[PDB]
Amino acid sequence: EWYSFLGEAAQGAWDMWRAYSDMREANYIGADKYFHARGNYDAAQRGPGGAWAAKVISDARENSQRVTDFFRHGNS
Amino acid sequence: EWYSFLGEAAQGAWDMWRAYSDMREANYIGADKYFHARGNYDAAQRGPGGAWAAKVISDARENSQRVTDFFRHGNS
Amino acid sequence: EWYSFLGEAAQGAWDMWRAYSDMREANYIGADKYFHARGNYDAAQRGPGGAWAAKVISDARENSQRVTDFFRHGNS
Amino acid sequence: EWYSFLGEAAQGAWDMWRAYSDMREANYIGADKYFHARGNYDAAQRGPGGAWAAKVISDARENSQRVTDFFRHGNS
Amino acid sequence: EWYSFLGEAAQGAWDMWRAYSDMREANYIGADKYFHARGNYDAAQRGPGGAWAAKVISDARENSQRVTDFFRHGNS
Amino acid sequence: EWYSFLGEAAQGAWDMWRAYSDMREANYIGADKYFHARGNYDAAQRGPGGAWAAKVISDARENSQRVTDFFRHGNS
Amino acid sequence: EWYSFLGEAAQGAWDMWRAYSDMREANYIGADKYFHARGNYDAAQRGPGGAWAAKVISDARENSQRVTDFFRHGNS
Amino acid sequence: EWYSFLGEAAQGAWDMWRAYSDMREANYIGADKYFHARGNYDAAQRGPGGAWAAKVISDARENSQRVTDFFRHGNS
Amino acid sequence: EWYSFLGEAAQGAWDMWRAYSDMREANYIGADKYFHARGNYDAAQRGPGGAWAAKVISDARENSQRVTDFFRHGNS
Amino acid sequence: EWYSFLGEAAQGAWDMWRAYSDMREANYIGADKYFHARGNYDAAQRGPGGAWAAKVISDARENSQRVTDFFRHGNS
């Protein structure tokens, strides 16, 4: 008897591995690059503002589980 | 008896692996690049504003499970 | 007896793997590139604003399962 | 009897490992780079402001579990 | 009897290890770099302000668990 | 605009009520009543045994819902 | 705009109420009543045994909900 | 705008109330009543035994909820 | 704007109240009543034994909640 | 703006009250009543034994809550 319901099961070699995750300069918020500027934004309003968040994540687990009413008996 | 319901099962070599994930400069929000500007945005309003979020993720698991009323008996 | 209902089952070599995921500069929101500008957006309103979100994801699992009333008996 | 419900199970060599996570300069908020500027932002208002947060994470686990009413009996 | 519900189980060699986590210069908030500037921000207001936080984390665990009503009996 | 998808909506009087639920002596498991017995069950084995449960419920709700990607805008 | 998805909504009088739930002597497990017995069950084995539970409930709610990615904007 | 997803909402009088819950002598486990007995159960084994639980509940709430990524903006 | 997700909301009189919960003599475990007995259970073994619990509850709340990533903005 | 997620909210009179909880003689464990007995249980073993608990509760709250990443902004 071998049962699985949501399962990462590996019975061998070089299985389910992950090598390269490459995210360079992913998230620029309200930034400027390689420019020449004169007198712009006179008396202006520029973001970020209000209620906000910026998140950068590579690997993360946030599982949740609900186990109830589990009965197990052996050999009779 | 071998049963699975939602299952990642590998019984061999070099199975289900993932090598390259390449997302360079994916998410620019309200940014400028390689420009020449004079006197623009006079007394203007520029975002980001309000209620917002920017998220960049490579690998993430957020499973949830509900197990109820599970009965197991052996040999009689 | 071998049963599956929704199942990723591999019994061999070099099966179900995924190598290259390439999404460069995928998501530019309200950004400008390689321009020359004078006096535009005078007293104007420019987004992003309000209630919004930008998300870039490569690999993600968000399964959910509901298991109820599972009975198992052995040999008599 | 081998059962799993949400399970990372490896019965071999070189399985489920993760080598490279590369996120350089991921999150620039209200920053400028490689520019020449004169007299801009006269009497202007510039973010970040309000209620906000910036988070950069590589590896993180935030699981939660709810186990109730678990009964186990042996051999009779 | 071998059961797991949320489980990192390794029965071998070189399994589930993690080698490189590389996040250089990830989080610049309201910073400037490699620039020449004259007379900008005259009588202006510049962030960061208000209620905010910046966090950079490599590895972190924040699990929580709720175990109730667990009954175990041996051999009869 | 009035929309419903799975909905118990009552706009009146004396609607959808439930008065009498009468289940007397519903569930007798391995019980005997009003008998005369001599010497039966000599060296015998009688249930209940193994992995089992008996539940009697009158009213119970165990709904579950999955809401994703809900966007609402007002008047322009 | 009035929307509901799974909803108990009452806009009146004497709606959706529940008065009588009557379950007398519902659950007798391995019990005997009104009998005369001599010498039975000599050297015998009688249940309840193993892994089991008996539960009697009148009213109970065990809902669960999953809300994700909800965006709301007002008037423009 | 009035929205509900799983909701007990009453806008009136005498709605959704519950008056009588009557469960007398519901749960007798291994009990005997109104009998005359001689010499039975000689050298016998009688339950309850093993891993078991008996629970009687009238009213109980065990809800659980998962709220993520909720954005709200006002009037512009 | 009026929103609810799992909500007991009453906007009136005599709503959602509960008056009578009557569970007399609900849970007798290994008890005897109104009997005449001679010489039974000679050298016998009688439960309760092992790992067990008996619980009687009238009203109880055991909710749990998970709130994450909640953003609220006002009027602009 | 009026929002609730798991909420007991009453905006009126005589709402959500609970008057009578009546559980007389609910939990008798290994007790005898109104009997005449001679010479029974000769050299016998009688429960309760092992690891067990008996609990009787009328009203009890055991909530738990997990609040994370909550951002609130006012008027702009």
Numbering used by the authors:
A (entry chain A), B (entry chain C), C (entry chain E), D (entry chain B), E (entry chain D), F (entry chain J), ...: 19 to 94
Could you pull the original sentences from the published paper?
Specifically, AA amyloidosis represents a systemic disease characterized by the deposition of misfolded serum amyloid A protein (SAA) in multiple organs. This 12–14 kDa remarkably conserved apo-lipoprotein acts as molecular mop to remove membrane debris and lipid degradation products from inflammatory injury sites.
Herein, we present the cryo-EM structure of fibrils extracted post-mortem from the diseased kidney of a DSH cat with systemic AA amyloidosis, deceased in a shelter with extreme disease prevalence. The fibril structure is composed of two identical proto-filaments, and exhibits the cross-β architecture characteristic of amyloid. The polypeptide of each proto-filament comprises 11 β-strands between residue positions 19 and 94 and adopts an extended hairpin structure. A central β-arch between residues Asp-50 and Arg-64 links two ~25 residue long meandering tails that stick together via side chain contacts. In the assembled fibril, the N-terminal tails are surface-exposed at the edges, while the C-terminal tails are buried facing each other. At the intra-protomer interface, the edge-tail of rung layer (i) contacts the face-tails (i-1) to (i + 2), creating four hydrophobic clusters, four ionic locks and additional H-bond interactions. On the other side, at the inter-protomer interface, the face-tail (i) contacts four rung layers of the adjacent proto-filament, creating two hydrophobic clusters, four ionic locks and two additional H-bond interactions. The higher dissociation cost is mainly caused by the eight-residue insert that increases fibril core mass and enlarges the buried surface area by ~2000 Å2.
